[PDB]
Write a protein that binds this ligand. Structure first.
Ligand SMILES: NC(=O)C1=CN([C@@H]2O[C@H](COP(=O)(O)OP(=O)(O)OC[C@H]3O[C@@H](n4cnc5c(N)ncnc54)[C@H](OP(=O)(O)O)[C@@H]3O)[C@@H](O)[C@H]2O)C=CC1
Ligand SMILES: CC1=C(O)C(=O)CO1
Length: 321
């Protein structure tokens, strides 16, 4: 991994950009000639191969986090997989040519980068990245970071450990599909229950749920069964708190949190991906892609429109970029 020839790295590239806050159908535009970000000393420049979309991308573009956002215009996209083309002078973990993946923004809602992953090149902190598992495609790898790390962190915060039961509210989405898998296959849960609509129950069971609950036909909080952990990925802590055992833990990723539930926002860390590497290599934990993925780089507005419908099963990925 010797330095790339310097004239081989472009200073402008194609990207999607918004210059004002609003709906993606209104504000998100393609720009054929946007600056490539200059790297800091603890960053690498990545040739982007694929990018995933997350709800945070559209909530951020609506201006929900404006008070702690970076300056507009913004190139959206948190999740990235691609190939290192340049390394900063303080970088030790990666070299030119490494295949890497991660969620660009250490603190999702505080100073996310101006130069996201929906571009041909992006700059990423060493600390947020991991080596791409060899058995995963770039589409599959791009799908993982924000959602898998959110799932992992929430389960750790809930103190999930071997033998305990957990209920997942929103089991079929980007995050919930990993909450199920991790709970069963990484945290050793004895029983994993999860909510989704009628046609998605079989998927939940396939991913590791012992009990798939159709929220369109019954209310989980009225079940007499109560859980050691409840992980809300929808935004219904009012009910979630009614499903937990005395002394158990309720976490949510969608506030506001009704005590005793807690709301957190993930911290993006490559070390979490590295910890999960063996489960990804063995296929014990798998990427989960929406059947509509991948969306070509020309179809980013449509990819966002589909994610904004709240119906995605697993991940919406953009490729090729
Ligand atoms: N605080 C943090 O750190 C983070 C917060 N988030 C937030 O978490 C939420 C989920 O994110 P993500 O998984 O990426 O979202 P997705 O858009 O991937 O979730 C879509 C899934 O949500 C399911 N869903 C919708 N309503 C319900 C319901 N009432 N009960 C059960 N399932 C339901 C749908 O299944 P169906 O079609 O069957 O309804 C669909 O499969 C978002 O609001 C996101 O902003 C995400 C990541 C990090
Ligand atoms: C990543 C993330 C979201 O999606 C939120 O809603 C809050 O933080």
């Amino acid at each position: 991994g010797a330095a790339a020839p310097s004239e081989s790295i472009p200073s402008v590239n194609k990207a999607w950009v918004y210059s004002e806050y609003g709906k993606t159908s209104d504000v998100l535009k393609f720009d054929p000639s946007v600056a490539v970000p200059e790297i800091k000393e603890d960053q690498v420049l990545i040739k982007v191969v694929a990018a995933s979309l997350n709800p945070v991308d559209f909530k951020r573009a609506l201006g929900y986090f404006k008070d702690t956002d970076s300056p507009l215009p913004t190139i959206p996209g948190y999740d990235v997989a691609g190939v290192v083309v340049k390394v900063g002078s303080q970088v030790t973990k990666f070299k030119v040519g490494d295949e890497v993946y991660g969620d660009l923004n250490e603190t999702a809602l505080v100073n996310p980068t101006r130069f996201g992953s929906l571009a041909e090149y992006t700059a990423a902190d060493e600390r947020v990245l991991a080596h791409k598992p060899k058995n995963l495609s770039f589409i599959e790898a791009a799908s993982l970071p924000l959602a898998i790390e959110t799932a992992h962190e929430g389960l750790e915060r809930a103190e999930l450990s071997a033998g305990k039961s957990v209920l997942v509210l929103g089991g079929a989405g980007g995050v919930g599909t990993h909450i199920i898998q991790l709970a069963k296959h990484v945290f050793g849960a004895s029983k994993v229950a999860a909510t989704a609509s009628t046609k998605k129950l079989d998927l939940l069971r396939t991913l590791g749920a012992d009990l798939a609950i159709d929220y369109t036909k019954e209310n989980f909080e009225d079940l007499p069964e109560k859980f050691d952990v409840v992980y809300d990925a929808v935004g219904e802590t009012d009910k979630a708190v009614k499903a937990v055992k005395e002394g158990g833990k309720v976490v949510t990723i969608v506030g506001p949190a009704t005590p005793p539930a807690i709301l957190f926002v993930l911290t993006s860390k490559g070390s979490v991906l590295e910890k999960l590497k063996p489960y990804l290599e063995s296929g014990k934990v798998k990427p989960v892609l929406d059947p509509t993925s991948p969306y070509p780089f020309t179809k980013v507005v449509e990819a966002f429109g589909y994610l904004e419908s709240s119906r995605a099963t697993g991940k919406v990925v953009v490729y090729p970029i």
